[PDB]
Amino acid sequence: DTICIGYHANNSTDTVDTVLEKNVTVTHSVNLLEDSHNGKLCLLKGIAPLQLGNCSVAGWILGNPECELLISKESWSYIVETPNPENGTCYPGYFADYEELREQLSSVSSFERFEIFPKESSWPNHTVTGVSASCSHNGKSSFYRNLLWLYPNLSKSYVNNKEKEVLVLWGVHHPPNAYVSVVSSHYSRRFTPEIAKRPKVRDQEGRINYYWTLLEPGDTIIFEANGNLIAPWYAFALSRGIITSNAPMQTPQGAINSSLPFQNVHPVTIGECPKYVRSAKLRMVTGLRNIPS
Amino acid sequence: DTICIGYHANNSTDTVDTVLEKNVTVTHSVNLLEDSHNGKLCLLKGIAPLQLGNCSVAGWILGNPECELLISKESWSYIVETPNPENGTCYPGYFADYEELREQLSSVSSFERFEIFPKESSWPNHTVTGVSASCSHNGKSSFYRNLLWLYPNLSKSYVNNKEKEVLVLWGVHHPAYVSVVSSHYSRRFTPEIAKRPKVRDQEGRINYYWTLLEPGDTIIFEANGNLIAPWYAFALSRGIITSNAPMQTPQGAINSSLPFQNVHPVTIGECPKYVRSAKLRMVTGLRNIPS
Amino acid sequence: DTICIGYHANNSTDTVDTVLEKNVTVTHSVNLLEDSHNGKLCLLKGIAPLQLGNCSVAGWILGNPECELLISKESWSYIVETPNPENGTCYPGYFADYEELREQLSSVSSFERFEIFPKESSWPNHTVTGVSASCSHNGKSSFYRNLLWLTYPNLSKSYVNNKEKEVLVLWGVHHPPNAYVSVVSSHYSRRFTPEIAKRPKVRDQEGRINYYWTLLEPGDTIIFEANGNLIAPWYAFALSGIITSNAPMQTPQGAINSSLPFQNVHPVTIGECPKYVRSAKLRMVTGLRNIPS
Amino acid sequence: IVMTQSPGERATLSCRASQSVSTSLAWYQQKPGQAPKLLIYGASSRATGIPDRFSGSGSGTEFTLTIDVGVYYCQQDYNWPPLTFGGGTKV
Amino acid sequence: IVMTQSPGERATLSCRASQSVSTSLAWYQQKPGQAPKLLIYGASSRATGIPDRFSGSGSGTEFTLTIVGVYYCQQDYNWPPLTFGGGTKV
Amino acid sequence: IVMTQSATLSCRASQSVSTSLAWYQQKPGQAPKLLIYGASSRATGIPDRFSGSGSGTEFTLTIVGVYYCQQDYNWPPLTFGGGTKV
Amino acid sequence: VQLVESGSLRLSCAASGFTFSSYGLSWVRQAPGKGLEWVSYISNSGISTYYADSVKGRFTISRDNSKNTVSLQLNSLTPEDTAVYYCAKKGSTLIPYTWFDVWGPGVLV
Amino acid sequence: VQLVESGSLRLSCAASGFTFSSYGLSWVRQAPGKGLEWVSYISNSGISTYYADSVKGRFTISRDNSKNTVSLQLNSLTPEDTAVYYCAKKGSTLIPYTWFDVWGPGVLV
Amino acid sequence: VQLVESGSLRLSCAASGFTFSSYGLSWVRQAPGKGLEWVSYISNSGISTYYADSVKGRFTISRDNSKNTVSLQLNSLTPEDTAVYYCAKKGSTLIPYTWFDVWGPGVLV
Amino acid sequence: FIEGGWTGMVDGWYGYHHQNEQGSGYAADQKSTQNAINQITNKVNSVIEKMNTQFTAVGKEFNKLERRMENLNKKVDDGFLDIWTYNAELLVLLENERTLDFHDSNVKNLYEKVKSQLKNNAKEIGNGCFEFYHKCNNECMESVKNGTYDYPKYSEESKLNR
Amino acid sequence: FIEGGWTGMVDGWYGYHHQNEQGSGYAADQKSTQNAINQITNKVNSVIEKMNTQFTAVGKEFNKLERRMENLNKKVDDGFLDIWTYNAELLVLLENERTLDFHDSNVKNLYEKVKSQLKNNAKEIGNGCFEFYHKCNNECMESVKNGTYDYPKYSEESKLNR
Amino acid sequence: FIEGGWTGMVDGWYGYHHQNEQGSGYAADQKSTQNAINQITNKVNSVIEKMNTQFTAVGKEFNKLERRMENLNKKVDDGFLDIWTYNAELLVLLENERTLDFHDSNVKNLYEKVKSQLKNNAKEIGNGCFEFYHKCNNECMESVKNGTYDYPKYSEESKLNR
């Protein structure tokens, strides 16, 4: 009789590498590098992400006519934007500090759209009307949707009643041919009108710049202006990310469904996701070598 | 006769872990994770730290009446501030920046309070008196201690005779052509009367600014309608922790030589590096199992 | 009729260390720590680096008289500046937004000096002469070389950017211690004003004159204006790397010629270079121990 | 264990058992008079020296030959002590 | 090495040595006639099978039993010269 | 292998030997006493006045009598050099 | 486990019900009214051996493995030897530890 | 490699041209008018052996190394044993694998 | 350390004061006026052996360990063999290295 | 000593190929199998977790005039990327190195375990193979596999078989 | 082969439990103990060192409008913390493994060392224990402990005691 | 075993010091030497690579009014420096530890190989040395080196003769 020792072997390659030598086969292995891709971007948290393609985030927040204002999107885990904006800013203008608003909307997932100001009784002396040819919607002249063009010394304030953070955006007219002063309880500024010549862009002969402030419950902000002002009409009340790409309804290039820690798809992502790494093959060995005889 | 082999064993657990098994005992081990805590914060360098309880750093630097100005503290390795400020800024106001100042005072370790300006020599034309009811002290009306309220086109300038850095803080009254002028720095603010809400029972504000000048520098001031003149330059001699413990780390002191700490990471001075782990024990001996 | 086993030994130390023990000899080893130094700074890419010693980068870009403007240096991989500047800014002044130009100028390796404005035709209505005693070149009065003092009509001029490359424009305004200057871009605006406050004397001069600088791309055009003073530009350093050292004709303290990954010379360097590390001796073992039997 | 067996003719053949054998199979051909020669050994793995014209494939109680007139044999070597040779084939 | 020894009543006993022995100790009980039966072994550690009513503790030249007849304590550190303790009346 | 011979001395060979060399001294009547062993290593106990160095088919000592140099590379056929008058 | 003892004079201790080849036996004497007294001991293999101080030479111990039985020669009877003799087995195969768990009826000489 | 076979009746298979001490020989019988049939086998060392089911005892096998030749005693002749006998060698030294590659002329008993 | 030598013909070299069982001895002849000449050598164990080129066959060497002495069977007393004979010991137990340190009085035959 | 695994023995990691006059085949061991699989699974578990990421909005925006911020951000990002790449690659290579040696050591331990019982009843041949001077039926296979080989029982065999 | 340590041997790391007709007890070795303790202490000193920190004013303040900076700072800090956690955990686990295995290897080495100089005068029993055919007094214990066991001295003994 | 490398045998890493009545000297073994050198060189080439960097304009400037940026930049730079220092030191020490034991293991492997080549025609003496009971000429050296030792051929007198 006879006895001999050995280990089970099979007919698979499953190439792996180690300290000693490259390109060695193994009976059983596990890969820590993942490549599944092209899965259509879906509800990360079972909710519809805020999709606003064909228009820029700025125009979205500022009532650009083209996108129809996406009146109803209560829950939006993340925002997916078209890499190339379309009609992203109806009126030529200089909008400042675009790293503190765009970073404020990366978390809020519930908007209580609320008509901040009245446009029925408190503005009888004001001539609420006007249009810009460069902002003529659907072949007809118009101005905007989230705020209105506009003589007495305008003075008004917010009642600050709701116990939530309230946002207010506005701007000032810059006639290319006025002691506007937002005054918060703990924030102040004082802009003035300019009359300097401007080159023509988007068929218009100048610009109109917009600002924006954030105030918490218990605050009260009082406005003022003499020569011009861009009154607000909708406060996008918050409930405190960005993905530049385009694809039918995560990552900018699809969805991943796996539990491995490392990823080869583009690093940038939103929410919990595997850490990215610049490598091609990371396979662990969980068995023994495989060579017949 | 007989000869056997083996290793000494004892009656202790000293749990450790490794790839072979979790919760494995060992005869002798050393823990690289430390948990000693609650030791009252003490002199890190044998000197009294600059505690500022009941008042904010702002008021402390700006002569707030409440804290009595802590007249005497020649050396202070670190500053400990109450996490919740009290009467941190008497007058309702708006500083210029409290990070280029709050950060520079994290290294200096001494001061020479120096009456930068003489309040009885060369400005009787002024009206040095003044008070704000909302800034009343000890139940009686008063304004401040580190600077004074204040009409000709007044002017003045320091010369930096002492060969050390001299700090100057001030502000302007927001109910003119205020213009600080350094040899290599300039600004030009203006007054602005406009409707504002009532806060701390007042109908306006006054904003404070502050500039740093080195030896060989002589700033020159100017203003027409308002000026908050300085009265004491906190001359330098070259960390911040929020805590409530009685008389380091925000929550006590540590006395050990291990490299890793489980107490809150934030600290001042040489201290063990922080890490988010529970048990880190090294094995310096052999396993322990009877028989 | 005898056999024995053994390994090769030699007469070298080549000290190495390990957790087993410190200061142990070895038959053969390779050092991963390099110390070659003092090599004179040479052409990193076979081109002459932009050397502008005796003058600061500021004055260099702004036509300081002392350095003679280094009229001809087409290709410069990197810029080496004297650690201590000399006559770095002829006229006392406050240059704003600085270090942004310094970071911008760390990549472009080609310049096309281009007289943006005509010094003879488009503006004879006002005089061009003017000098400063503190800026008297070679012992004789003068002002500058890159830009133009001006000495009244409402100046109104504009470039158009006909060349399909980025064009830089630097200028400043006059602060006389004894004017709606307004650069205007298609998508950038500012509005400075003149000051009259008293100033201390520095560099024998009574005041200051501050300089700004804007960048514009192809398809853009910028229009100037001013009433009280203006410092017109006269040459754009059209585009298409900082080290402080004193060595003659790459690191601040010499050159390195080796393939090791780690360096002991000062960490700061330019281009691909071994990673710096704070260690003394890192020797790898490639053989067996060496101790006579 | 037991075995069994089934011009420009296309030469194919099959051998089957009543039990599972993974690889311990071979093939032996012999022309009349001369001793049998080796053929593909292992699970149809090509043998050496022999002309490449001979070939085959199959496994798991089902083996086939893919292709010299005469007889051939299939042999199983899994359960060792009681070796067994298949039947006689024809062409 | 040498040894020696001291219903409703508390049965406690003590056995002591004149030298240090760590653990090599046990306990043997025997009624008249029948052969001795095992008891706690290995420095008071409970011996299986036998009733758990019996128990004890103590170490380092001082040992004690915690619970009618006689009992014995034995030491097994210095091996070749074994030794048994004396009787223990109760 | 073969050897030969010529304060200092000189032992020369006709083949390469690394270190298997030594030196032996003796005066008439008394048995030879050990001298520096190895290529040049100095034996203990013996007075250190004697010394030498050199290798690779070329060896030399350094300081009446006689001495000997021996090679021990090709082992089975040992060999002792000649005399050394001084 | 089963053990029995029967028996100058000859004494043998037969046993069964376990692995006799992987254990060490022993012998303990008993006085008429006093405590028990150790006698001797042998390791399992059958090489290492010891004896009582006051017996070396008189009583000898030998073992086998085929019969799973041991025996003391117990030669040179003396008047003081009027003692009750027993049989016993170690409780484990490890050398350092020891205790006599298995106990037999013994023999009254 | 070469092999030859010559020959109750004795029968031997002499061979050479390889390492006779590091291989296992074997034997296969052949009928006059049908396939072959295994009869026996031995390991290289010469300690392990097997036999055909219908032959155990009747036929015997023995081997040497110096002569590099084996032989079967082949006793108990019986008419149905009129079969052509051959000689063959394994193809490798590994136990699990097997195949008869080196085939000889055989013998017509 | 101590060594002595006394003595066809027989010659033995007795020594003591060290471990005779863990060293290799040797022999060296001496001419009346010429230099020394190697004659033989043996390893410590007593198996490996060598001899002079012009002597293989006549002079024989044997060693023991009980009395820490070795003997040479000096046979074939050719008249030209009038050479002074000595005794010596290696300086270490490692095979590759060699040197004769311990030197004895020798013998004048 | 052992190079390649047999194609047979469909299930298991370590086992024996017994051959006897009555039968032959494979047989898979379990104890070492359980130990090895448990340890390897523990290694895999240890490596996989200890990797947790929060709502990390890696993407960042920067204005035309803040290019210093752009440079700083790209610096930190690429530094983290490179550090993690190197760390993970080194860890995976180390684990790959450390698993195969452990497997081989376990195999060697099992080989010595079987050697332990058969001290002279058998005679080593090579390639981790053994055979006995005495002949034994199937049950001796089970006896040796469980380690209950009765050495005296077959010690009496006439070992002078030469 | 070796499973658990004895409660005896009050001091030391490796030792022998000798036993002879005259006496018995424990005994501890020196050289192996010194080597092991020295190496482990060196490991501890190496790991504890190579760690230094300057004035780490970790706490930082940022204004209302600079939340971008807040996010950047949080990213940097949490990344550093995670990197250090992973590094330290891996290092500690590796060190534990590499000390346990080293201890086992050293004890095995001592075992084969003692085996070396007793080729035939003894006979292995198991569990790393030996016994001699010849009887020897206490002094042979010292002889084997020091390695000076003169094999020929007791080789002549009649090893045919069977 | 491993005590110290011979000064002789200039070229190679391992070898044998044969000795016979006809001659003596050194001899290297290429088969193991080439494997060892190739593997070690490959490991060095592996560790050296994977280190690549882009245009790292480490030097940065910050205005008098931005000390916060200065502190942040110093923090990040010093952190990166320390992390890389620790990582590189650990890696180099680990590889140094791993190389020497591998070399020793290879030497031990060669030793057990030569031991396996023949069993009783020789007799171990120590320090990794062997001697044959029989006597063989020069060619037997080559025979053993190739592993072609023929045990029965040199079984002559392979018996008690001393």
Could you walk me through the main structural features you see in this protein, from its secondary elements to its overall organization?
The complex is a heterododecamer, with 3 copies of chain A, 3 copies of chain D, 3 copies of chain G (109 residues) and 3 copies of chain J (162 residues). Chain A is mainly β and 293 residues long. Chain A is 2% helix and 23% strand. Chain A folds into 2 domains: 1-37 and 256-293, Hemagglutinin Chain A, Domain 2 (Hemagglutinin, Chain A, domain 2, Ribbon), CATH 2.10.77.10; 43-248, Haemagglutinin, alpha/beta domain, HA1 chain (Hemagglutinin (Ha1 Chain), Chain: A, domain 1, Alpha-Beta Complex), CATH 3.90.209. In chain A, strands 3-17-18 form a 3-stranded parallel β-sheet, with no helix packed on it. Chain A has a 3-stranded parallel β-sheet with strand order 4-5-16, with no helix packed on it. The longest helix of chain A is centred in the first third of the chain and has 5 residues, at 57-61. With 91 residues, chain D is mainly β. Chain D contains no helices and 7 strands. In chain D, a hairpin with a 7-residue loop joins strand 6 (71-76) and strand 7. Chain D is globular and about 35 Å long. Chain G starts with a strand and ends with a strand. Helices cover 0% and strands 41% of the residues of chain G. Chain G contains no helices and 11 strands. In chain G, strand 3 (25-30) and strand 4 (36-42) form a beta hairpin. The chains are: A mainly beta (293), D mainly beta (91), G mainly beta (109), J mainly alpha (162). The interface between A and J is large, with 58 and 67 residues. The PDB classes it as viral protein. The entry lists the keywords Hemagglutinin, Macaque. The assembly is 12-meric. The entry is titled "CryoEM structure of NC99 hemagglutinin trimer in complex with Fab T009 3-E04".
Features:
heterododecamer; A: 293 residues; mainly beta; Hemagglutinin, Chain A, domain 2; Hemagglutinin (Ha1 Chain), Chain: A, domain 1; three-stranded parallel beta sheet; 1 helix; 19 strands; 23% strand; elongated; D: 91 residues; Immunoglobulin-like; three-stranded antiparallel beta sheet; 33% strand; viral protein
End-to-end span of chain D in angstroms?
26 Å
Number of domains of chain J: 1
> How many H/I helices of chain D?
0
Name the assembly state. Answer: heterododecamer
- By CATH, the architecture of chain D is named Sandwich
For this structure, the CATH topology of chain D is: Immunoglobulin-like
CATH homologous superfamily caption of chain D: Immunoglobulins
Characterize the overall form of chain J: rod-shaped
What is the top-level CATH class of chain J?
Alpha Beta
Using the coordinates above, name the CATH class of chain D.
Answer: Mainly Beta
CATH architecture of chain J: Alpha-Beta Complex
Give helix and strand order of chain J, one letter per element, not per position: EEHHEHH
| End-to-end separation of chain J | 28 Å
* Order of the strands making up the biggest sheet of chain J: 1-2
Number of domains of chain D: 1
**Can you count the beta strands of chain D?**
7
Radius of gyration of chain D: 13 Å
